[PDB]
Design a protein around this ligand. Structure first.
Ligand SMILES: */C=C\C(=O)Nc1cc(Nc2nccc(-c3cn(C)c4ccccc34)n2)c(OC)cc1N(C)CCN(C)C
Ligand SMILES: [Cl-]
Length: 283
């Protein structure tokens, strides 16, 4: 390994400021923000995630965070800094174009085949990087893929599930059922191959330009629906070559699903001749 490595920074409250709210949740709030490293003159657009609030827990939280800061891939968000002063705050680089989910909804008219296929490649490369690290994301969704540029997206919120662990309120009180693999839903089994299921859902969200999955069906019904063998419909732009890939991700047998390495090859091949695999008007 190289001498220089990515390192988590512990930040002071003075260092960064919240400018506006980007998103909200039971977890907390995410803010558009500015970071200035201590004793430095540079201002860095950040996103600050502040959890609803621990001190004993702080040591546990720190261990989770260190991993999140070790992630070193172009397609995975890296946790830059943490602050534990009153409540946990997580600092990452700001992604100016927001998430893909909102992106494909806004720009539905104007998105070409090459862009969509390319995003599919980048998400798979990032997931593959995590799998090599033996890290399981557990929450892959279009909402959690962010746009640095039309040509650069990154998977966010890796490892957040564990952190939300440090907790009891968290358990005594939710999971993204619609995105989840069946094993995850029934036994809370999380693997790279349950991440591959969610990858397929994420691709479906992109290919339909942001449609909510299983919109009629309620979440509770979903397990029954899957066992019955129903699956998300083929998106209209998708050719069967693309859909069969999605279908493979959603197979009940985990080992049967495609590996991330395979997905990169497959979507790379499609990206090379985009019009062949996606039929969009104005392409
Ligand atoms: C899918 C919603 C979304 O992310 N919208 C969004 C995001 C950003 N920038 C940004 N950068 C880094 C990290 C995040 C981020 C991480 N997590 C877990 C978030 C949850 C909720 C919101 C943002 C999160 N976000 C952004 O920067 C310009 C703008 C933006 N949008 C789309 C504007 C707000 N609309 C949702 C109204
Ligand atoms: Cl939504």
């Amino acid at each position: 390994e190289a001498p220089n490595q990515a390192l988590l920074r512990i930040l002071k409250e003075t260092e960064f400021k919240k400018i506006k709210v980007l998103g909200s949740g039971a977890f907390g709030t995410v803010y558009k923000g500015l970071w200035i490293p201590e004793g430095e003159k540079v201002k860095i657009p950040v996103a600050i995630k502040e959890l609803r609030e621990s001190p004993k827990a702080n040591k546990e939280i720190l261990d989770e965070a260190y991993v999140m800061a070790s992630v070193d891939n172009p397609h995975v968000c890296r946790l830059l800094g943490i602050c534990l002063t009153s409540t946990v705050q997580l600092i990452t680089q700001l992604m100016p174009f927001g998430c893909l989910l909102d992106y494909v909804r806004e720009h539905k008219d104007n998105i070409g085949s090459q862009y969509l296929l390319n995003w599919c490649v980048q998400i798979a490369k990032g997931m593959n990087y995590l799998e090599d690290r033996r890290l399981v994301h557990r929450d892959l969704a279009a909402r959690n893929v962010l746009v640095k540029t039309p040509q650069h997206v990154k998977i966010t919120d890796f490892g957040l599930a564990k952190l939300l662990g440090a907790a009891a309120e968290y358990h005594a009180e939710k999971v993204p059922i619609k995105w989840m693999a069946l094993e995850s839903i029934l036994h809370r089994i999380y693997t790279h191959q349950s991440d591959v299921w969610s990858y397929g859902v994420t691709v479906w969200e992109l290919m339909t330009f942001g449609s909510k999955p299983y919109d009629g069906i309620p979440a509770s019904e979903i397990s029954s629906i899957l066992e019955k063998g129903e699956r998300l419909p083929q998106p209209p732009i998708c050719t069967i070559d693309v859909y069969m890939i999605m279908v493979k991700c959603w197979m009940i047998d985990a080992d049967s699903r495609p590996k991330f390495r395979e997905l990169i090859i497959e979507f790379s091949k499609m990206a090379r001749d985009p019009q062949r695999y996606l039929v969009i008007q104005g392409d």
